[PDB]
Ligand SMILES: Cc1cc2nc3c(=O)[nH]c(=O)nc-3n(C[C@H](O)[C@H](O)[C@H](O)COP(=O)(O)O)c2cc1C
Ligand SMILES: Cc1cc2nc3c(=O)[nH]c(=O)nc-3n(C[C@H](O)[C@H](O)[C@H](O)COP(=O)(O)O)c2cc1C
Ligand SMILES: Cc1cc2nc3c(=O)[nH]c(=O)nc-3n(C[C@H](O)[C@H](O)[C@H](O)COP(=O)(O)O)c2cc1C
C-alpha cells in the first residue's frame with residue numbers, strides 16, 4: 001500500500017547542505033513510499049497573535065493541510081546555536097496555532113546535516129521537546145545526524161553523492177514507514 | 185557608578201504580557217541602573233546566509249551595537265511549544281553571525297511570563313543552551329518565571345501592577361548588576 | 369482485554385509524596401488495567417561495567433523481565449536539581465545494559481510530583497531524552513505534573529487525597545492503555 | 553598566584569577512558585595550577601532524605617569541603633543514555649543537599665569522552681541545567697568533547713596519548729583559571 005511523506009526544510013540558502021539532503025529523499029525513498037517537498041518556511045511571517053486574528057497566512061494553511069493529509073513528515077534541518085533555527089521554529093509555531101493542529105498523531109522523522117562532527121544532534125532534542133507538546137510521534141530509531149556533510153554532497157551539483165549516507169537515510173525512511181503503519 | 189541594561193522582547197503582539205513586564209523594568213530598575221528597550225525583533229528578516237552576504241540588515245547591526253555597548257541584556261520572552269519563540273531565536277541567530285559577536289562575555293538575565301503555572305520555565309533552559317555557545321554569562325540566581333500573569337498585569341492599561349512581582353524583578357536586576365561588576 | 373502496568377518509583381524516603389502517588393495507581397486504574405509495583409531502585413548497586421562483566425545483579429534482571437512482560441511502565445519520580453534523581457537514572461542505566469533491553473518498544477507514561485509550582489516538569493524532558501535512546505514510546509498526552517503535592521496528599525496517612533489529581537491520573541492511564549494497544 | 557583544581561570522575565570501571573583523561577590533568581595543568589582528584593563517587597550511598605536525617609555520610613562531607621576550598625572543579629564524565637550517569641548525578645544530588653552548598657559560585661569546566669563521534673556532548677548540557685540550580689559558573693569556552701577516545705588513549709597503559717587532545721585540555725584549564733580569577 002503506498003504512503004506519502006512530506007519534507008520540511010530548515011535552511012533558506014541555495015547552497016544549503018540540508019536542502020541537498022532533502023532533495024535526495026524522493027530519489028532514495030523505498031518502494032511504496034512517495035516523497036514531496038513542502039513550501040518554504042520563508043514565505044511565513046513571524047508568528048504574531050495580532051496577525052493570526054486578522055487571518056492565517058495562506059502558506060501556513062497550505063503547509064498545515066499538506067502535513068495533515070500526509071502519512072509522515074521528514075524534518076531536514078541544520079543546527080543553529082545548539083538549537084533549532086528560529087525560522088524553522090517560527091513555522092512550527094504557526095502550525096501549532098492551526099486548528100485542527102496538523103502534527104498531532106503525526107509520525108515524524110528528524111534528519112540533520114552539518115559540516116562539524118556533531119551533525120546537528122543538539123537541535124534534534126530541542127525539536128523533540130516541542131514535538132511532544134504537539135503530540136507528534138517522532139521516530140526514535142534510527143537517528144540521522146550527518147556530520148562532515150561537505151564531503152558527502154558535491155558542490156556545484158548540490159547533490160547528495162555519498163552512497164553510505166544515501167543508504168542510511170533510505171533505511172530511516174523505511175523505519176518511519178513501519179511507524180506510520182503501526183499507528184494506522 | 186551607573187550601569188545600562190537593554191531589553192530584548194520575545195513577543196510581537198500589542199497586548200503581550202511579556203511586553204508589559206518589559207516596560208516595567210526601567211521604572212523598577214534600582215538606583216545606579218538605567219534600562220532602555222531594544223528594537224523589535226520583527227523588523228529582522230529570517231536568517232539566511234544568502235541575505236547576510238548581500239549585507240547585514242540594518243536593524244540587526246543596530247541591535248548588535250546596542251547590545252555590545254550595554255552592561256547587560258535582559259531577555260523577556262514567552263514560551264512557545266516548550267521552547268523559545270522562533271522569532272526570538274531568529275534574532276539570536278542574526279546576532280550570532282555578527283562580527284564581533286555582541287553576546288560574548290555579556291551578562292544576561294532571563295525573564296519569562298505566562299498565564300499557565302510553569303511561567304515559561306522550559307524556554308529558559310533551551311535559551312541558556314544557545315547562550316552557552318555565544319559565551320554569554322547568564323544569571324543563575326534568581327530565576328524569573330511569572331506564571332498566572334493575567335492576574336499580575338491589568339488589561340487595558342497593560343501595566344505590571346503586581347507589587348510582589350515588581351519587587352522580585354527589581355532584586356533580579358540587582359543580581360544582574362552584581363554580575364556585570366564581578367566581570368568588569 | 370486486560371492489561372498490566374508496572375510502576376517505577378524514583379524516591380527512596382518512606383514519606384515520599386511520589387510514592388503515595390504511585391501507591392494510588394492500582395486503586396485508580398480503570399477497568400481492565402492491573403498495576404503492580406517494581407522492586408526498589410535502592411537495591412541496585414551503582415552502574416559499573418566491571419560489576420556487569422561479573423554478572424548482572426539479580427534485582428536488575430528481575431526488574432528487566434517484569435518490565436518486559438508488562439504492557440506498559442509508569443515512571444513516578446521527583447525532580448532533583450532540575451533533572452532526574454541519580455538513583456533513578458542509575459536504574460535506567462542498569463536496564464539499558466541488559467540484553468535484550470526491556471524498554472525497547474515499551475509504552476511509558478511519566479508522572480512527577482513536587483511541593484513547588486513546577487511539579488517536576490524539568491525532570492520529565494531529561495528523562496524523555498534518555499528514553500529516546502532506549503526506543504521506548506513515551507506518552508505525549510496527557511502530561512502529569514503534580515505541583516503543590518503537599519496539599520494533595522493527606523499527611524500522617526500518606527495517601528493521595530486530591531480527587532481532581534486522582535481522576536487526572538486515571539485519564540492518563542486510559543491514554544497509556546490506548547497507546548499500548550495501538551502498538552500491538 | 554597559584555590555583556588548585558579538583559577533578560570529579562564520572563565512571564567507576566578500572567579501564568575508564570574518562571579516568572585516563574582525568575589522570576592526565578595534573579600532568580597537563582599549566583604553571584601555577586595544581587590539580588588533585590576527589591574521592592570516588594562510588595563510596596556514596598544512594599541519595600535519601602531518610603539517610604540524610606541520620607547524617608551526611610563522611611565521604612560526602614569530605615568531597616564538599618575539598619570542593620569548597622578548591623579554586624575550581626573539573627568534571628570528567630562519560631555520557632550514559634544521552635544524559636549524565638546516574639552514579640555521578642547521585643554525587644551531585646548529595647552535594648546539593650549539603651549546607652553550605654559547595655558548588656555555589658564555583659567555577660567549573662566540563663570534559664566528556666566517548667568512543668563515538670558525539671564525544672559525550674549530550675551529557676554536558678543536561679549537567680549544565682543542574683549546575684544552574686546550584687549557582688556554579690560553568691566554563692562556556694572552550695568546550696571539551698573527546699570523541700573517538702579509543703584511539704586517543706594508549707591501551708594496556710591507559711594513558712592519554714593524543715597530544716592535540718592533551719594541549720586542548722591545557723587550554724581549557726587556562727580558561728578555567730581565568731574564569732576563577734575574574735570571580736574573586
Ligand atoms: C547562525 C548559525 C549558527 C550555527 N550553529 C551551529 C551549531 O550550533 N552547531 C553546528 O554544528 N553548526 C552550526 N552552524 C553551522 C551550520 O551547521 C552550517 O552552516 C550548515 O551548513 C548550515 O546548514 P545549511 O547548509 O543547510 O544551510 C551554524 C551556522 C549559523 C549560520
Ligand atoms: C504558538 C504558541 C505556543 C505556546 N506555547 C506555550 C508553552 O509551550 N508553554 C506555555 O506555558 N505557554 C505557551 N503558550 C502561551 C503563552 O505563554 C501565552 O500566549 C502568552 O501570553 C504569550 O506571551 P505574550 O503575552 O508576551 O504574547 C503558547 C502560545 C502560543 C501562541
Ligand atoms: C537533592 C534534591 C534536589 C531537589 N531538586 C528539586 C528540583 O530541582 N526542583 C524541584 O521542584 N524540587 C526539587 N527538590 C525537592 C523535592 O521535590 C521534594 O523533596 C519532594 O518532596 C521529593 O519527592 P518525594 O516526596 O517523592 O521524595 C529536590 C530535593 C532534593 C533533596
Ligand SMILES: Cc1cc2nc3c(=O)[nH]c(=O)nc-3n(C[C@H](O)[C@H](O)[C@H](O)COP(=O)(O)O)c2cc1C
Nearest residue numbers: 461563568569570571630631632633634666667668
Ligand atoms: C549504560 C551505558 C550508557 C551509555 N550511553 C552512551 C550514550 O548515550 N552516548 C554515547 O556516546 N556513549 C554511551 N555509552 C558508551 C560509553 O561512552 C563508553 O562505555 C565509554 O567508554 C564509557 O566511559 P568510560 O570509559 O570512562 O567508563 C554508554 C555506555 C553505557 C554502559
